[PDB]
Ligand code: HEM
């Protein structure tokens with residue numbers, strides 16, 4: 289990722305916030321020169337992405353995790369709200385379309401996790417916390433977790449470098465910014481909320 | 490990507506439909522074992538993803554394209570609607586959470602595209618086609634395009650392999666499936682609509 293200076297994070301908490309808010313991530317490694325990716329829930333341990341630790345799991349039947357045994361670098365991509373910006377919204381001549389989006393790319397050394405039950409149970413706790421009411425695993429569900437464990441592989445990524453993009457129209461002037469924000473308010477309220485939180489800095 | 494048989498596409502038309510519907514893709518290369526990714530609009534040339542050609546562009550200022558000569562194996566990830574499935578929705582004991590989603594992973598060789606103007610103009614046409622009204626570039630806009638072109642690097646991907654995941658709760662029983670779809674209908678109608686279209690020709694036991 290090439291972070292355009294105008295679209296850089298305003299505060300390091302912004303990157304960590306996007307990661308925590310969007311745990312369904314893309315985990316990428318290189319296998320014989322070919323990138324291979326798995327969609328998986330990934331949670332953050334620590335206050336910052338850079339220097340933090342990511343924890344995730346995937347299927348044992350998914351051969352991707354075999355590339356982690358040698359502890360290569362892996363890239364984990366967290367994607368926030370996003371949306372196409374049509375020149376119809378800009379309502380100007382000379383116009384060029386855009387795509388507004390936010391994302392955090394974390395790269396670091398992967399390590400297979402022996403504590404696979406701990407990872408999945410911490411993932412439940414993290415993903416249920418924003419819900420009201422939250423689901424708490426019962427003894428019967430935790431027994432089911434143990435029964436499922438042979439089929440899961442858990443992993444940790446120690447983040448060496450983080451790049452975060454917040455391309456949220458902050459370069460526009462007040463007039464068009466309002467047009468873009470109002471257009472997203474309708475059917476992309478997540479993007480509109482992220483625009484509001486992005487100017488909160 | 491490992492495509493679990495239970496979540497496989499019923500027809501290759503499903504993969505191409507997802508790609509066309511979700512053009513803001515992730516373009517990934519690997520350089521000396523380190524993956525690098527760029528978010529970019531990518532369009533499909535042809536009726537099928539496998540064997541088809543993808544066209545996209547990124548910033549010339551983005552050093553990612555410099556790797557295309559020495560590392561031409563590239564993955565393009567197209568992501569459709571998705572959403573967390575809480576066991577609260579199931580309303581059953583023994584339960585395990587899930588994340589429902591659909592995605593297409595296209596892998597192949599990348600090459601620089603010589604006609605960058607054609608790529609960006611076809612990208613406009615594709616992204617405006619589902620809109621009403623659709624925006625057609627004015628002469629002044631097309632002049633601006635030509636003025637901006639030096640700052641673009643356009644690329645082509647000849648797709649060797651396509652893998653598609655449609656993890657849309659098809660393994661649940663009908664009762665639980667209905668609960669999941671109804672829960673998504675409110676604030677994730679795109680995901681609910683995708684569940685509906687995916688279950689049309691979904692084949693168990695195939
Ligand atoms: C907390 C929320 C959870 C989410 C969002 C989630 C999501 C997922 C996803 C997306 C996959 C596919 C990964 C891949 O493509 O390789 C997967 C696989 C798997 N996960 Fe989880 N999971 C969660 C919790 C758990 C728990 C608590 C367990 C208990 C052991 C578990 C065990 C498994 C197993 C056994 C598989 C392999 C499935 C198969 O081979 O068919 N997961 N999970």
Ligand code: HEM
Nearest residue numbers: 385386387529530547548551609612613634637638640641
């Ligand atoms: C059709 C909808 C379009 C979308 C969604 C779109 C999106 C994008 C994105 C996301 C980037 C950043 C890529 C990166 O990170 O490297 C980019 C770069 C760029 N695109 Fe497009 N684009 C569109 C159309 C066009 C058109 C018609 C032109 C006319 C030449 C154009 C010219 C450029 C330029 C000059 C850059 C580099 C900007 C810079 O250096 O800051 N784009 N575009």
Ligand SMILES: N[C@@H](CCCNO)C(=O)O
Nearest residue numbers: 436439585586587588660
């Ligand atoms: N789908 C598997 C395990 C999924 C757990 N992660 O979603 C099952 O239901 O046995």
